[PDB]
From Swiss-Prot:
NAD(+) binds at residues 22-25, 70-71, 99, 122, 156, 272, 296. DNA ligase that catalyzes the formation of phosphodiester linkages between 5'-phosphoryl and 3'-hydroxyl groups in double-stranded DNA using NAD as a coenzyme and as the energy source for the reaction. It is essential for DNA replication and repair of damaged DNA. It comes from the Bacteria. Belongs to the NAD-dependent DNA ligase family. LigA subfamily. Disulfide bonds: none annotated. This is DNA ligase. The active site is at 101 (n6-amp-lysine intermediate).
Length: 297
């Protein structure tokens, strides 16, 4: 009874993915062998893609459906008070969403009818490289979302510091060039031409936004991040909605001292106007949003 067993195997495998991230091993090998004798039982979201595959990703250059955002920077309290004053003068009272800027490989993941179908590096923000097969090996990326949306979700892929060090340990022993940091270890593992090598590296992802909110019920950035969780994605819960710029400054103070302490590196904090109508209202200047800014440590 292959139908029941394939459905069973998908449930068991996808649950491993939603969990942690070698019953697993044997289960995966059983589904692979089913798909070899019955290629018609391979669905677009089959979990056998987690192992990597024979197809080498292209690294073809592809434009994102929508260019990713290009953020201005802030370097001090004065930069942030000016940011918030520009906002308050233009459109009045706002709340802010504050989040940690993960030091990893930025990617955009394209979903069509809720299936994961293309993953690109952020590249220059307009054009990225296609590493779809490599990204499918990350358990924390859902192969099918919980609603059948057509959206590009934007994330950062990273390697935990502990696994980066174990990888450098193996380079140290082979006296190869070491990765300078966990960021380069993620980017390097995701840009392998053999996605089977990628599969064997320890990678995860945090999702931080989407290209288009049309089909979301969310009215604010904090609410959209909760909606992304509900749809199946992994988001970073160190984010916080705050009421004002004093709240931003207090979030920055707290995280500044803690920037070495998490399992992954971070390179600053991103602050956005929370309400989505208010983002639209604030607009862009010189091709960068007037309602978002990246604070650099």
């Amino acid at each position: 009874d292959l139908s029941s067993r394939v459905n069973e195997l998908h449930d068991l495998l996808n649950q491993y993915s939603y969990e942690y991230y070698s019953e697993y091993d044997k289960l995966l090998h059983e589904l692979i062998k089913i798909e070899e004798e019955h290629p018609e039982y391979k669905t677009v979201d089959s979990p056998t893609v987690r192992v990597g595959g024979e197809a080498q990703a292209s690294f073809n250059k592809v434009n994102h459906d929508t260019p990713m955002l290009s953020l201005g920077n802030a370097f001090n309290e004065d930069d942030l008070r000016k940011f918030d004053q520009r906002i308050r003068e233009q459109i009045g009272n706002v709340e802010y969403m504050c989040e940690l800027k993960i030091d990893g490989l930025a990617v955009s993941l394209k979903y069509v009818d809720g299936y994961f179908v293309q993953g690109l590096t952020r590249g220059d923000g307009t054009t990225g490289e296609d590493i779809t097969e490599n990204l499918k090996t990350i358990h924390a990326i859902p192969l099918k979302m919980k609603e059948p949306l057509n959206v590009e979700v934007r994330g950062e892929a990273y390697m935990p510091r502990r696994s980066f060090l174990r990888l450098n340990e193996e380079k140290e022993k082979n006296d190869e060039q070491l990765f300078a940091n966990p960021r380069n270890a993620a980017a390097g593992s995701l840009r392998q031409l053999d996605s089977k090598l990628t599969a064997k590296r320890k990678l995860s992802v945090f999702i931080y936004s989407v290209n288009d909110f049309t089909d979301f019920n969310a009215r604010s950035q904090s609410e959209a991040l909760d909606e992304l969780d509900k749809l199946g994605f992994t988001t970073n819960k160190n984010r916080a909605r705050v009421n004002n710029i004093d709240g931003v400054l207090e979030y920055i103070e707290k995280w500044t001292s803690q920037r070495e302490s998490l399992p992954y590196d971070i390179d600053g904090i991103v602050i956005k106007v929370n309400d989505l109508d208010q983002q639209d209202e604030m607009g862009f200047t010189q091709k960068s949003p007037r309602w978002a800014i990246a604070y650099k440590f």
